[PDB]
């Protein structure tokens, strides 16, 4: 009752803040050509994924009040599909950003040649296709179930094999491999920063490179912190078949809520960790 409405209010606040902040980030990225660097394109893609994953929050939060899905089976399909599209899009975007930082730092000779914004858009498109390669089955195999109590939106499979195969594919191709790639790139970026006096020659350019790399690393760490609980909890609950309990339900709710809250948390990080973003967030809002 009181807890239910409190959770609904928290979800609504997170949802509205998420759409507002991510739409603002997208607009300030698309506003100016000086905001069209290789890193900014991937920031745009991450904000796009967050905005898509937040637009479905009011539908997901309304169900807590009646336990019924009156919106429609097509909306259930779209919501469930975006719920799986978000992870892949965001994590592959972060992996591409971290590899881009390595190309910039440890190979500056070919960095400007191979980090053309058109190339970055090509890599973003490749990210979208790779995300589709594991999201489209969820799009086709999601449908509403006309339960005796009320209509609910759940996934369907032909099921104990495919349901676990999808989870294994997500955990392998969407968490461990991108995290390892990011770690591998940064473990050499750090050494290249330490052992080299000047990266770009210009002190201002070197400072900008190091600051934007710090911001990228902080965003990556924030996403990792926000998304490890849900992936690990999903894997474990299937692995050892944790039975229903109050603590288990609270942990599940917290994991989902924080994974969704990351979408609204991102604009705070961009505002607090980049001078240009902070200036844009005040110029356009005034």
């Amino acid at each position, epitope marked *: 009752m009181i807890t239910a409405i409190t959770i609904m209010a928290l979800y609504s606040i997170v949802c509205v803040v998420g759409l507002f902040g991510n739409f603002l980030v997208m607009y300030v990225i698309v506003r100016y050509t000086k905001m069209k660097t290789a890193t900014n394109i991937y920031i745009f893609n991450l904000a796009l994924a967050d905005a898509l994953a937040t637009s479905t929050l009011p539908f997901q939060s309304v169900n807590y009040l009646m336990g019924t899905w009156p919106f429609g089976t097509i909306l259930c399909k779209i919501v469930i599909s975006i719920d799986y599209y978000n992870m892949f899009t965001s994590i592959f975007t972060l992996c591409t950003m971290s590899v881009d930082r390595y190309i910039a730092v440890c190979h500056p000779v070919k960095a400007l040649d191979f980090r053309t914004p058109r190339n970055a858009k090509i890599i973003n498109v490749c990210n979208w296709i790779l995300s589709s390669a594991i999201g489209l089955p969820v799009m086709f195999m999601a449908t509403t179930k006309y339960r005796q109590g009320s209509i609910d939106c759940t996934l369907t499979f032909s099921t104990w094999y495919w349901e676990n195969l999808l989870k294994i594919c997500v955990f392998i191709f969407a968490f461990i491999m991108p995290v390892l790639i990011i770690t591998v790139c940064y473990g050499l970026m750090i050494l290249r*920063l330490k052992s080299v006096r000047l990266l770009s020659g210009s*002190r201002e350019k*070197d400072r900008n490179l190091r600051r934007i790399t710090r911001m990228v690393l902080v965003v990556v760490a924030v996403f990792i912190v926000c998304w490890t609980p849900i992936h690990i909890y999903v894997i474990i609950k299937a692995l050892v078949t944790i039975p229903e309990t109050t603590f288990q339900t609270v942990s599940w709710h917290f994991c989902i809520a924080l994974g969704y809250t990351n979408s609204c948390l991102n604009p705070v990080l961009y505002a607090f960790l980049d001078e240009n973003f902070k200036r844009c967030f005040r110029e356009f809002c005034i």
Partner: nanobody
Amino acid sequence: RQLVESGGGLVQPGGSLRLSCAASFRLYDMGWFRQAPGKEREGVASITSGGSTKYADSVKGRFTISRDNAKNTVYLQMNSLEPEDTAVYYCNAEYRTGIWEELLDGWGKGTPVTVSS
């Protein structure tokens, strides 16, 4: 980070002095400069992290500057000192506040050297 200089004192002509500079993310360059009351600063030495050294025309053949990267301490051995080498010698170091920070220069307080007794 504070730059401390020492080793400066009254020395008879022809004596020897061991100058010292101490700095407490990574120190790449460290230099020395001399300044007379009626003269502008003239570069005397310049050493990198690798250890390559560059000297002034009059300084050459009498000044030896070497870097101890383990302690991040540089020292300048002063040889064949003449009264014309009476000035305040300064230690200048370039470093980075943090790994993600920019390159920044630092000026020492200066040590006074007088060759006469």
